[PDB]
C-alpha cells in the first residue's frame, strides 16, 4: 500500500506545481481524486488534513489570479472533509474566516451577489462551531456592506432583504440598536431608489 | 461465425487500448456495438459477461480520469446486459456496490446532486436483488451524507426531501430510531439555514 | 435521357463510396436528390426500388459507425418511396423488421427514449401491412424492455405509460394474461421507484 | 446611365458564376441589391423580368445542391417583383408550379413539415391568379402526401389538421366524395396512431 | 485646442477609409466617438453637421454592400444630432426620405418585418417635421406594400394590423376611399390566407 | 511590508501600461486585486485614493476606445471605495459628474436603454452627497433626452415611464413648469407613436 500513497503524494505535488501555471481547477480535481484514493487506501488522518490544507492554500491563489468563484466550491467541500477527519475546531474557524475573505473580495470585483450565498452558509457554519460573537457581527456587517454595494451597482430589490435577515441575525446575537437602526435606514434608502426602477 | 467473433474481440481490445489514452467514451461506444454484434452471433454467454466486465472496468477508469457522470450510463446498461446473460446475483451486487462507490466520489468532486438519483436507482436494484439490510443502510447513510453536503454547498431546498425519503427507507429497513432522530435533526438544521435564502 | 440516368447512378454510387469514408449523411442526401431526379426521368420502378435498397442498406451502417439516430429518418422516408413504387408487402415487412433492430441498439447505447417513438410508428405500420401477430408481440415485448431499462437509467414517469399502451396492443393481439400481469408488475415496481424522485 | 446599367449586369453575371462555385445565397443577395439599383435606374422592364428569371433559375439549383429552405424566400419575393413589373400570368403560374415542385423534394429530404406552409401560400396565390381546377387538386393531394409522411416521421398531431383544411379545399373545388373519404380515412388512421404518443 | 479638432477630423477620415474597405460599423463607431469629442471641443455646428452627413452618407453604403439592419441605428441617432445642431428642416426631410428608402429595400432583400417599425417611426417624425400629406401617403402605401409581401412570404397574422393602422394614417391624411377599400380588400384577402395556418 | 507595497504599486502600474495597449478590463481586474492587497498591507489612505483615481482615469478611456459598458462597473465600485476610504465629497461629486458624462455618450453610440439605470443611481448618489439642485436637474434633462431618443430608436413603452419619474424629481428638486409641460408633451408624443405598435 505505502508505495501508492507516496506516488499519490507525488501526483498531488506535481499537479499543484502544474495547476499554478495552468490557472485551472481541473488539474486540482485530479489531485483530489488522488487524495480520495489515499483516504480509500488508509493514511494518517493528520497527513490527509495537511494534504487538504496544501490544496485549500493553493485554491485561494487560483481563484484570485483568475477571477472565478466556482474554484472555491471545490475548496468548501474539502473543509467538511477536514471536519470529518477531525481537524480541530479552532483550525476550522481559522480556515473559514480566511475563505469568507476571498468570497468577500471576489464578489465585489466580479460584481455578482449570488457568490455571497456561499458566505452566508459559511457564517452559519461558524455559528454552529461557535466563533466569538463580535466576529459574527463583523462578517454580517461586512456582508451587509457588499449586499448594499451590489444592490446599488446592479438593480434587483431582493438583495436588500437578505441583508435585513442578516441584520436580524445581529439582533438575535445582540448588538446596540443604534447600529441596527443606522443599517436599516441605509437599506430602506437603497430600496427607495430601487423602487423607482 | 468464429472469425467475425474473434475480429470483434480484437476490435474491443484495440478500442480499449485507444480509449484509455484518448480519454473519451466515444471510442468505447463502438466497442459496445461490437459486443452486441457478438451477442447476435451467439458467442458464449459467460464470454460476453467477462467482456462486459472488461468494459465496466474501463468505464470506471475513464469516468474518474476525466470527471463527468455520462460515461457511467453505459456501465448501468451493461449491468442489466450481465443480468440478462445470467451473471450470478452475488457478482451483480459486487459491481453495483463498486459503481455506487464511484457515483459517490464524482458527485462530491464535480459538485452536482443530480447524479445521486442514479445511485438511489442502484440502491433499489440491490434491494430487488437482495443486498443485506445493514449494507443497504450503509449506502443510504452515505448518500444521505452527500445529499446533506450538496444541500450546504448550494442552495436548493428539494435535496433534503430526497434525503428524508431515504431516511424513511432506513426506517422501513429497521434502523434504530435514535440514529434516525440524529440524522433528521441535521437535515432540519440545514433546512432552517436554507429557509433564510 | 439514358445519359442522365447513368450519370445519376454514377453520382449515387460514387457518393455512396465517399459517404462510407467521410462518415456523414449529407453525402447521401445528394445521392437521394439524384434518386428523385432518376424518378423524374422515369427510371424503371424496380431499378428505383433496388437503388433505394442500395441506400437503405448503407444508411444503417453509417447510423451504427457513428451513433446519431437522425440518419435513419431518410431510411424511413425511402421505405415509403418503395411502398409507392410497389415493392412487395413481405419485403417491406422484411426491411422494417431489419430497421427496427438498429433503433433498439441506438436507443440503448445513446441512452435516449425519444427515438423509440419511431419504432412504435413502424410497429403500427407493420400492423397496417400485416405482419403475423406473434412477431408484433416479440417487438412489443422487446420494446417495452428498452422502455423499462431507459425508465431506470433516465428518471421520467411518462415512459411507462407508452409501455402500458404497448401492453394493451399485446392484449389486443390476445397474448396470455400471465405475461401481461408479469410485465405490469415490473412496470408498477419501476413506477414506485420513480414516485420517490 | 447605361454604363452603370451594363456594369450592374456584369456584377449580376459575375456574382451568379461565383455563387454557383461558392454554394451560398449571400452572393445572390448582392446580385438582387444590384437588380434593385437597375430597377431604380429604369432599365427595360422585360430585361428586369429576364434578370429576375436568371436569378430564380439559379436559386433553385443552389437550394437543391446543398439542402436548406431559406434560399427559396428570395425566389418567392422575386416572383412578386416580376408580377409588379407586369410579367405574363402564365409565366408566374409556370414558375410557381416549379417552386412548389422544389418545396416538395426539399421538405421530404430535410424531414421538415414547417416549410410546407410556403407551398400552401403559393397554392392560394395560384388560386388568385387562376389555374385549371384539377391541377390545384393535384398539388393539394401531393402536399397532403408530404404532410401525411412527415406526420408519421415527426410525432405531432397538428400537421394532419392543415391537411384536413387542404382536403376541404379539394372538396370546395369539387373532386368526387369517395376520393375525399379515402384521404380522410388515411388521415384519421394517422391521428389514431399519434393519439398514442 | 484646434490641433485636437483637426486630428479628430483626420481620425474620422482615416477610420472612414478603413471602414468602407473593411466593411464593419464598429470602425465608424470610433469615428462618431471622435465627432462627439469635436462637439465637446466647440467645433462649429455646420462643420459638425457636415461631418455627420459625411457619416450618414457612408453608413447607408456599408449597410447595402453587406446586408444587415443594425448599421442604420447609428444614422437614426445622428439625424437627431443634426436636428440639435440646427440642420435645416428641408435637409432633414430630404435625408430621412433617403434613409427610409434603404430600410424599404433592406426589409425586402432580407426576409424580416421587424426593421419596418423604424421606418414607421421615421414616417411619424416627418409628419412632425411637416412633410406633405401626399408624400406621407406615398411612403405609407410603399410600407403597406412591404408589410403585405412579408405577411405572405413568412407567415404571421400580426404584421397585417400595422398596415391597417397605416391605412388609417392615410385616411387621416385624406385619401380617396376607393383606394382605402382596394387596400383593405387585399389585406383581408391576406388574413383569409393566414387563417389557413 | 514596504517591499510588498512597492511591488504591488509596480504590479499595478505595469498592468495599467499594457492594459491601454491590449484594450480589455481583465488586465485591470488583477491591478484592482493588488489595490485591495495594498489596503490589506495598510498603505496610506491618500496614496490608495491616488491609485483609485489613476485606475478610474484609465477605466473610462478603455470603456470609450472599446464601446461596451461593463468596464464602468469597476469604476462605480472604486468610487464607493474612495467614499469609504475618505476622499472629500466635492471631488466625489466631480468624479460622479465625469462618470455620468461617459454613460451619457456610451448609451447612445451602442444604442441601449438599460445602461442608463447606472446613471440614475449615480444621480441619486449625488443627491445624497449634496450637489446643487440645478446641476442634478441638468443631468435629469439630459438623461430624459437620451431616454427620449432611445424610446424613438427602439419600441418599448417603459422607457418613457422612467423619464416621467425623472421629470417629477426635477419638480421635487424645483424647476418651473413650462419646461415640465414641454417635456411631457414630447414624451406623450413618443407614447402616442408607441401606441400604434
Write the topology of this structure.
The structure is a homohexamer of 197-residue chains.
Chain A: H1 2-22, H2 25-41, H3 45-65, H4 70-85, H5 89-109, H6 116-129, H7 133-153, H8 158-173, H9 177-194
Helix pairs in contact in A: 1-2, 1-3, 2-3, 3-4, 4-5, 5-6, 5-7, 6-7, 7-8, 7-9, 8-9
Beta fraction of chain A:
under 5%
Query: Largest chain-chain contact?
Result: D-E, 21 and 16 residues
For the secondary structure, the number of strands of chain A is 0
Task: Give the radius of gyration of chain A.
Answer: 20 Å
End-to-end C-alpha gap of chain A:
64 Å
Oligomeric state of this protein: homohexamer
What summary fits the major beta sheet of chain A?
A: none
Q: How do the helices and strands follow one another from N- to C-terminus of chain A?
A: HHHHHHHHH
Instruction: Compute the number of helices of chain A.
Output: 9
Helix content of chain A: over 70%
| Helix-and-strand structural type of chain A | mainly alpha
| Overall geometry of chain A | elongated
PDB class: de novo protein
Keywords: oligomer, repeat protein, DE novo protein
Assembly: hexameric
Entry title: C6HR1_4r: Extendable repeat protein hexamer
What does this protein look like?
Six copies of one chain form a homohexamer. Chain A has 197 residues and is mainly alpha-helical. Chain A has a domain of 87 residues. Helices cover 84% and strands 0% of the residues of chain A. In chain A, α4 packs antiparallel against α5. Chain A is elongated and about 65 Å long. At the D-E interface, α2, α4 and α6 of D face α5 and α7 of E.
Amino acid at each position: 500500500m505505502e508505495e501508492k500513497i507516496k506516488e499519490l503524494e507525488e501526483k498531488v505535488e506535481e499537479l499543484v506545481k502544474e495547476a499554478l501555471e495552468k490557472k485551472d481547477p481541473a488539474v486540482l480535481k485530479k489531485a483530489l481524486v488522488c487524495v480520495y484514493e489515499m483516504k480509500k487506501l488508509g493514511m494518517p488522518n493528520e497527513k490527509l488534513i495537511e494534504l487538504l490544507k496544501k490544496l485549500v492554500e493553493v485554491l485561494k491563489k487560483l481563484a484570485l489570479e483568475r477571477v472565478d468563484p466556482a474554484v472555491l466550491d471545490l475548496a468548501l467541500v474539502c473543509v467538511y472533509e477536514m471536519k470529518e477527519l477531525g481537524m480541530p475546531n479552532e483550525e476550522l474557524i481559522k480556515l473559514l474566516k480566511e475563505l469568507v475573505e476571498v468570497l468577500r473580495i471576489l464578489a465585489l470585483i466580479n460584481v455578482d451577489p449570488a457568490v455571497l450565498d456561499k458566505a452566508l452558509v459559511c457564517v452559519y457554519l461558524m455559528k454552529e462551531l461557535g466563533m466569538p460573537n463580535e466576529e459574527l457581527i463583523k462578517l454580517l456587517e461586512e456582508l451587509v456592506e457588499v449586499l448594499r454595494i451590489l444592490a446599488l451597482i446592479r438593480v434587483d430589490k431582493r438583495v436588500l432583504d437578505k441583508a435585513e435577515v442578516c441584520i436580524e441575525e445581529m439582533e438575535e446575537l445582540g448588538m446596540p440598536e443604534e447600529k441596527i437602526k443606522e443599517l436599516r435606514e441605509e437599506l430602506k434608502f437603497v430600496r427607495e431608489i430601487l423602487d423607482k426602477i
